[PDB]
């Protein structure tokens, strides 16, 4: 209730979130402790500092007029509140594939350059975090213009959602489903970074005279910063500058209203006309929702950064850390073979759900990881050594039948070993989704932890089929294919 009490709690939260990593075994304990301080501050504040009297659909007409006055397409689509994805665009006419149906000029966008020329300019030129973090600079740019009643982007800000499904909005028990998974660490870092950045910039705004002219000095609640960073991470683009020197982050009105579907990237930027463009990924009939393809991101990135779980994600993947140990007898040769192939000695690879399960780089690593001494010499010496390295990532030309049997045996054992590290099984996860009534945010976490295990289980079956196949070629002594 008192400004001095908030200054005390933010300074305590700043010191709590600035401490180093407490170790993987204590990250959940620190996460609950940080939530306790954040919720204590949030329950003492008044939510969003700037609220609007009308509903969200009431401001879309002003968004269409404001965009039309600056040369953006406003015909052929309408805003419809869909249940599955939220608000989106629906075609009012038939749209054929590869048809340019949406263009947004540069003037309508909110970029890092427009943040430097705004009221945040003076503080941007002095604060080191804003200069190095363009995403954070975009968030405060969105907050300052939101608190500016006469802002140029007011028709756009009044149409943004007031809440998101990022893990920052999850409850403690909803994040609890992600225990013993790979994704929960990124949820911990996201909550710790957001809590630290808010407490830091709250103290700077109240003390640094360069922020005295900012409207955030009158009111800057945690709900404002959680809404700001969530609006950025779920909607921001990476576009080139007006001259094409470097890249920059931007909020693109109208274009960021299309929801995600599987396909190819059809949203591009035209530098000659200085505008964002979107062509139809597929044929949209009148009355159908207009979808685009966001990117080849995994469901873990869609949940944490985009705020939704996408079923049938063709690019879903899990991480797997592999490396050659220095205690290996053949470490010197294996490190040299990998170095000549452009592959590190130890890295974090990926396991994909769709075929093939392993990429060309991971296959080349697993082959060298299981090579004998004779096979390592043939990749290091002679006139045909460079030719052998050139085909390490090709599944058609193996090193030997024995090399394939050993690499697929190792992958089947490693993927099965990672499956035993989760606190639940695949059958138990499917049982919860069927016999329990859950929220959307709870379903996102359970289907995320289930998706990790389904990718691991398919890798076990894929490695077992390959292991048994190359075992037959080894038992029958079949001739090895030669790349000619």
């Amino acid at each position: 209730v008192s400004p001095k009490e908030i200054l005390n709690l933010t300074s305590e939260l700043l010191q709590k979130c600035s401490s180093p990593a407490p170790g993987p075994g204590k990250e959940w304990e620190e996460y609950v402790q940080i939530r306790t301080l954040v919720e204590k501050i949030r329950k003492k504040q008044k939510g969003l500092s700037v609220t609007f009297d009308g509903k969200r659909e009431d401001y879309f007409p002003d968004l269409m007029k404001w965009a039309s006055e600056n040369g953006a397409s406003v015909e052929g689509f309408e805003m419809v509140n869909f249940k599955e994805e939220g608000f989106g665009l629906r075609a009012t006419r038939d749209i054929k594939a590869e048809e340019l149906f949406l263009w947004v000029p540069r003037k309508l966008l909110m970029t890092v350059e427009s943040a430097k020329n705004s009221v945040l300019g003076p503080l941007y030129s002095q604060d080191r975090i804003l200069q190095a973090m363009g995403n954070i600079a975009l968030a405060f740019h969105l907050l300052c213009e939101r608190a500016s009643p006469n802002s140029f982007w007011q028709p756009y800000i009044q149409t943004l959602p007031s809440e998101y499904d990022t893990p920052l909005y999850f409850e403690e028990d909803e994040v609890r489903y992600l225990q013993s998974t790979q994704a929960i660490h990124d949820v911990f870092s996201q909550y710790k970074n957001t809590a630290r950045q808010y407490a830091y910039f709250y103290k700077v705004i109240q003390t640094h005279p360069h922020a005295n002219k900012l409207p955030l000095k009158d009111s800057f609640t945690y709900e404002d910063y959680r809404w700001a960073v969530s609006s950025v991470m779920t909607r921001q683009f990476q576009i080139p500058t007006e001259d094409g020197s470097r890249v920059t982050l931007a909020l693109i009105p109208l274009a960021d209203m299309c929801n995600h579907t599987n396909g190819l990237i059809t949203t591009g930027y035209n530098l000659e006309d200085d505008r964002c463009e979107c062509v139809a990924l597929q044929d949209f009939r009148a009355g159908e929702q207009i979808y685009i393809f966001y990117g080849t991101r995994s469901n873990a990135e869609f949940v944490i950064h985009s705020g939704f779980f996408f079923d049938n994600n063709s690019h879903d993947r899990v991480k797997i850390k592999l490396g050659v140990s220095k205690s290996d007898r053949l470490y010197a040769m294996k490190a040299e073979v990998l170095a000549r192939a452009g592959i590190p000695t130890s890295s974090v690879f990926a396991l994909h759900f769709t075929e093939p399960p392993i990429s060309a780089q991971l296959l080349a690593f697993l082959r060298v990881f299981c090579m004998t001494e004779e096979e390592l010499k043939e990749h290091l010496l002679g006139d045909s050594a460079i030719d052998r390295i050139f085909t390490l990532g090709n599944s058609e030309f193996p090193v030997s039948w024995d090399n394939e049997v050993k690499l697929w045996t190792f992958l089947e054992d490693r993927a099965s070993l990672l499956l035993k590290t989760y606190k639940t099984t695949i059958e138990e996860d499917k049982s919860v989704l069927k016999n329990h009534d859950l929220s959307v945010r709870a379903k996102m976490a359970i289907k995320l932890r289930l998706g990790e295990k389904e990718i691991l289980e398919k890798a076990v079956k894929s490695a077992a089929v390959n292991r048994e196949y190359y075992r037959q070629q080894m038992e029958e002594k079949a001739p090895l294919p030669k790349y000619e």
Binding site: M133, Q197, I265, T266, G268, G295
Partner: peptide
């Protein structure tokens, strides 16, 4: 294809200490 394909909601780095 496209000259400058852009990604909706591209993953960025928010770790200010990294």
């Amino acid at each position: 294809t496209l000259k400058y394909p852009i990604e909706k909601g591209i993953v960025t780095n928010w770790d200010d200490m990294e």
